[PDB]
Structure 1
């Protein structure tokens, strides 16, 4: 049950300066990078071509090469006519891909944002502005919707190519996608923002996959445990910390317990 997403980031600073950079993710592993500076899409995994042949991959890449140039020109052409309604600097983001479900199912998506805000999607057979998008987009979107060759291609990419490609990645990327890396944990403390307190920190690093942490007094979970966000390590593992703000002397008897799929029933328990 994975989300596959191709993310494009385009910056237009003026008439003469633009760049477009992409990254692709299968769940939380990066499979591709496509820099503005590169002609070709780079694999960031051995299995990034999935089960497509070299011919199929070349064709898919060619389509995207044509697209990247056509995209940049269309946007700059649109900035010449719209001036000075909207002008530089302009940021555009696309997020396209599919979500793979229980055995059978799959749903695809293509979303576009302008200046950090969701404004357009592809839906079924056409481009649509979302409710509340700025009305000057209605004409460009009409012009784009008149291009039936683009619409057919995007339909093929979303309905067919996207779920096809991902099935192959899931197979060819099995051992990375199902890898198990063990958390290592440690305890520290830092000054509290509350007087007469210290903040105890349980750090958990190097674990994969993401699901994973509680401060404990014996069997009693400490409901003051404040779990932070999942932070990435550079080696495709995860970091998380859980804090507990404690009165001085109340510190004794506290433990941090960690459960993770990779430890196989055998929790880490550290004592303060």
Structure 2
């Protein structure tokens, strides 16, 4: 799923705007500077210095209008403090969605804001406020249908270098903390890999051990990923087990670690 999107987090105080290529953050908005911070050289995409100036001014008046806009309309819409508004919008096909208090609330479809039905009349009356200026809704449409597609094309091009790099995983073995009585928990850690897709299993020779429980893939600050895979086994049955890792960056040469040495012990 190749997509770019912008998110807005506003808490009622706190106002955060950032841009994302899926998991990867590419832009940040600094309000006091009132500028768009580019997190990578290629974050500018194939867009020129002057066109970025244009986008900043749009981001300028739009964020501050909307932030203060919510800030003013609260009592009307029965918004009780504290509350949070989140929106995300971008393209892949386009989308723009707003949540209130962590739930689906309204979304932008074609040319106007429509209330999610399960969100009551509170959402419908927010849509009346949001659908006042039709021209401003028309600007929103064009941002999503025109600007965002153009942008994501340049961005992927300019970022192709970074985006299609291969970083080899490293792996290691340890004892897991919560084994049942008579049992051990073997854990195989895999870190430092990019891109994300990865394969890891506990093995007895060529036989994959189907008890292998793979955790979530977790991020590292350097942009690589982390995963742990655990296997519960009877203690008298942990001999000859190995952890096998496959990854695009290894070109066929799996990492293979063996449950042995002080781990066994002896």
TM class by shorter chain equals: over 0.9
Tell whether 2:16 aligns with 1:21: yes
Give the drift of 1:37.
Answer: 4.4
Give the drift of 1:271.
Answer: 0.6
Structural RMSD (CA):
1.2
Give runs of aligned pairs for residues 2-41 of structure 1, distance below 5 A: 2-12=2-12, 18-41=13-36
Tell whether 2:164 aligns with 1:171: no
Q: In the alignment, is the contact (CA less than 8 A) between 1:19 and 1:36 conserved in 2?
A: no
Q: Which residue of 2 aligns with 1:98?
A: 91
Give the drift of 1:28.
Answer: 2.4
Q: Normalising by structure 1, report the TM-score.
A: 0.91
Tell whether 2:178 aligns with 1:192: yes
How many Å separate the matches in 2 of 1:127 and 1:195?
57
How many Å separate the matches in 1 of 2:37 and 2:69?
25
Q: Which residue of 2 aligns with 1:265?
A: 252
Instruction: Name stretches of at least 5 consecutive residues in structure 1 with no aligned partner.
Output: 13-17, 100-106
How many Å separate the matches in 1 of 2:234 and 2:49?
63
Q: Normalising by structure 2, report the TM-score.
A: 0.93
How many Å separate the matches in 2 of 1:193 and 1:149?
62
Q: Which residue of 2 aligns with 1:89?
A: 82
Q: Which residue of 2 aligns with 1:153?
A: 139
Q: Which residue of 1 aligns with 2:125?
A: 139
Give the drift of 1:146.
Answer: 2.7
How many Å separate the matches in 2 of 1:259 and 1:74?
51
How many Å separate the matches in 1 of 2:241 and 2:193?
23
**Alignment partner of 1:247 out of 234, 249, 252:** 234
Give runs of aligned pairs for residues 31-110 of structure 1, distance below 5 A: 31-82=26-77, 85-99=78-92, 107-110=93-96
Give the drift of 1:4.
Answer: 1.2
How many Å separate the matches in 2 of 1:74 and 1:114?
15
Q: Which residue of 2 aligns with 1:102?
A: none
Q: Which residue of 1 aligns with 2:224?
A: 237
Q: In the alignment, is the contact (CA less than 8 A) between 1:192 and 1:245 conserved in 2?
A: no
How many Å separate the matches in 1 of 2:182 and 2:82?
49
Q: In the alignment, is the contact (CA less than 8 A) between 2:176 and 2:230 conserved in 1?
A: no
Give the drift of 1:36.
Answer: 4.4
Q: In the alignment, is the contact (CA less than 8 A) between 2:165 and 2:195 conserved in 1?
A: yes
Q: Which residue of 1 aligns with 2:264?
A: none
Give the drift of 1:5.
Answer: 1.7
Deviations 1:123-180 (A, max 9, x none): 1111001120131221231232131121111111000000100000011001111011
How many Å separate the matches in 2 of 1:140 and 1:240?
42
How many Å separate the matches in 2 of 1:136 and 1:117?
13
Q: Which residue of 1 aligns with 2:105?
A: 119
How many Å separate the matches in 1 of 2:135 and 2:62?
12
Deviations 1:54-109 (A, max 9, x none): 12111111101101110012101111334xx331111000111111xxxxxxx111
